[PDB]
Design a protein around this ligand. Sequence first.
Ligand SMILES: *[C@@H]1O[C@H](CO)[C@@H](O)[C@H](O)[C@H]1NC(C)=O
Length: 248
Amino acid sequence: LPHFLVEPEDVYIVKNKPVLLVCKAVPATQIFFKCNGEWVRQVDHVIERSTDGSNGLPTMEVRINVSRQQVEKVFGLEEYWCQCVAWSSSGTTKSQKAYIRIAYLRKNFEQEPLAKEVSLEQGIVLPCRPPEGIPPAEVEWLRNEDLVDPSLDPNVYITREHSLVVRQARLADTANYTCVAKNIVARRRSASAAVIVYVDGSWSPWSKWSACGLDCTHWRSRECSDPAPRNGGEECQGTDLDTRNCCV
Ligand SMILES: *[C@@H]1O[C@H](CO)[C@@H](O)[C@H](O)[C@H]1NC(C)=O
């Protein structure tokens, strides 16, 4: 019985360029391809006959070119497939069904990231669902122009559901985040989502009481710097100076 060395793999049509399906078996006397329940012509087959290194048995290597027009013309229930069959003195053998699909990628995203307002300690999740296409598109994130790398920082990482997760604000500051769907046919960039990191201003501890001056009054100082109000963040609610009656 013949044993396959090289089996036909699942190939995709990029643009309109032909695909090659390599098939090799040992021992082989005759080798033919069967596409969608129909045999391929002998002239279309590119045969390669050679003697095996391990034992004195004939080895055959065959390759067929399948164009874009050949795939799209076949209309039915199941997808375009090509199975390689090998012959010998003992019997026949069947290889794995290699599925040939026309590669594509849509323009409209299923889900795009939106603008979010977050504080210094709180964490945010930026969701993204890439457009439909065969094979599925890989997801890459951009912080403004620069590519987001999850290996550089543990606080910034991309989940299995393509969403970007950030747990802090100083480790990932203010930036327009855009989701990029990457496929062999086309690269699709989503709309930029403005992520703003605000610092809510809270008062600093009270200073020491000043000496009792004239008109029986003494003041105390206060500052809005623990933490200081940055970006959109709200200012400190209260007074900068506190007056109290204390003398002669
Ligand atoms: C996003 O870019 C716009 C200009 O196109 C800018 O005005 C805005 O502040 C940016 N947002 C962030 C978070 O950088």
